[PDB]
Design a protein around this ligand. Structure first.
Ligand SMILES: *c1cc(=O)[nH]c(=O)n1[C@@H]1O[C@H](COP(=O)(O)O)[C@@H](O)[C@H]1O
Ligand SMILES: *c1cc(=O)[nH]c(=O)n1[C@@H]1O[C@H](COP(=O)(O)O)[C@@H](O)[C@H]1O
Lengths: 257, 257
């Protein structure tokens, strides 16, 4: 039956990145991942600073930052360490192994130098995980596999989802869990991170679908909610982040018994 | 009955980007897309200039360029216009509509500002295309959908592939074709581009698989071969590009009549 985050952090087969994450989740009482979908470095950093105490993780799309530099990432690393959260680059790699290795290590972004976690789609087959790990393992990084998507018409279903779970099991030295809408694996060493979350049900006008923290954490058995616009679009993002943190945490407690 | 590229360029439902490409393929007698997988701007520009005459298209991975600036891309466009090839950014978009829109238009890369073509995975559902098209249509761009992949263990098969074809047909305003290992649609308005191509049998150690141009174009019915390492790793890249051009071109002619 259901183990606490602190207990999972001590599971035998647990990745040190997952263990570090589960520990600060337990310590800070948050299972909220902020999706910091903004185009300005000054806004990203002011969000990370102010909301840092409320979150276990900050999720970035650096390819959307109009003023990206590696110095912005350095300041973000300082905030992650000071407020205690992980940095997750939402790169959604979906290319052959030979290419994703360079996209993760190199270019302008040098994602691997600053991101604790990245994610990958499984559509290319396991070579995508093998390419990323050749870079990630040396650097003690973790990866999430996209077993399910939140958007209308997603093909990440059935046999596809099963393939994701299988691939994660075969590369558990590097893969720490899933992007999914539910619990897709019974193994408690794996983390389940769920995007497509807002307090009000609904969606956007480009196929995003939203479910509540209570539905996702409490009934669907996921671990962490990933929240973008639900927080970002509020006048007071701190208040918003706290609302989401409390909903996700209490749903987690109430799942625990 | 198969139409020539020049005849296809004139089909009533042809996309202007597809038309421009078909015309120059006929005019230059090339159906080779160079995959310019290099890490330096001068290397990209050098290959583009030297091999421009031999190719219909130059496929880029900007996110692997150590010294990207929009100035490099201006220089690239100059070569494209001079030697007459299309620029294809192999970004392989794989996220929700709202995000991809920003990844296509914005950030440091401003992909839509310079890429005649991009491609997208269909796994997120059709919102991925709707988001891209919001930026792509005003800028007169085209998109390819990834219907099949060249790598081992690929999940882009069966109903996934059929979903890709369906999505393309329903967004023909913007979608001009497929990344696939074979012909996936009988509609001659759609282009088929095939990566995983080398003259000799084999693969790499991260799940890539190679098939020959005669196999891919002649027997499987694709239009364009995408070749990276088979050209880039050769001592004489000009002679290597010419060998692939002549192979793909003859295979096309044989299939024709
Ligand atoms: C990625 C995968 C997925 O299945 N669903 C997603 O929404 N995403 C990314 O998560 C963020 C959600 O933001 P919001 O809808 O809460 O604003 C977003 O960054 C998207 O790229
Ligand atoms: C993308 C999709 C796919 O199914 N197969 C692919 O190989 N790619 C991309 O195409 C290029 C292949 O290069 P090479 O193996 O000929 O060197 C590469 O850029 C890869 O990202």
């Amino acid at each position: 039956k259901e183990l606490s985050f602190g207990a999972r952090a001590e599971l035998p087969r647990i990745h040190p990145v997952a263990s570090k994450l589960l520990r600060l989740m337990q310590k800070k009482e948050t299972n909220l991942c902020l999706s910091a979908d903004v185009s300005l470095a000054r806004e990203l950093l002011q969000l990370a600073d102010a909301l840092g105490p409320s979150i276990c993780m900050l999720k970035t799309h650096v390819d959307i930052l109009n003023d990206f530099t590696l110095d912005v990432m350095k300041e973000l690393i300082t905030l992650a360490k000071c407020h205690e959260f992980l940095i997750f680059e939402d790169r959604k790699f979906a290319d052959i192994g030979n290419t994703v290795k360079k996209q993760y290590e190199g270019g302008i972004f040098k994602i691997a130098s600053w991101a604790d976690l990245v994610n990958a789609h499984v559509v290319p087959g396991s070579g995508v995980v093998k390419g990323l790990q050749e870079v990630g393992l040396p650097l003690h990084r973790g990866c999430l596999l996209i077993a399910e998507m939140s958007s209308t018409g997603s093909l990440a279903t059935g046999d596809y989802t099963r393939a994701a779970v299988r691939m994660a099991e075969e590369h558990s030295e590097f893969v720490v869990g899933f992007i999914s809408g539910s619990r897709v694996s019974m193994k408690p060493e794996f983390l389940h991170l769920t995007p497509g979350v807002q307090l009000e049900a609904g969606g956007d006008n480009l196929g995003q679908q939203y479910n509540s923290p209570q539905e996702v954490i409490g009934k669907r058995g996921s671990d962490i909610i990933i929240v973008g616009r639900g927080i970002i679009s509020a006048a007071d993002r701190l208040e918003a982040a706290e609302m989401y943190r409390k909903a996700a945490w209490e749903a987690y407690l109430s799942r625990l018994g």
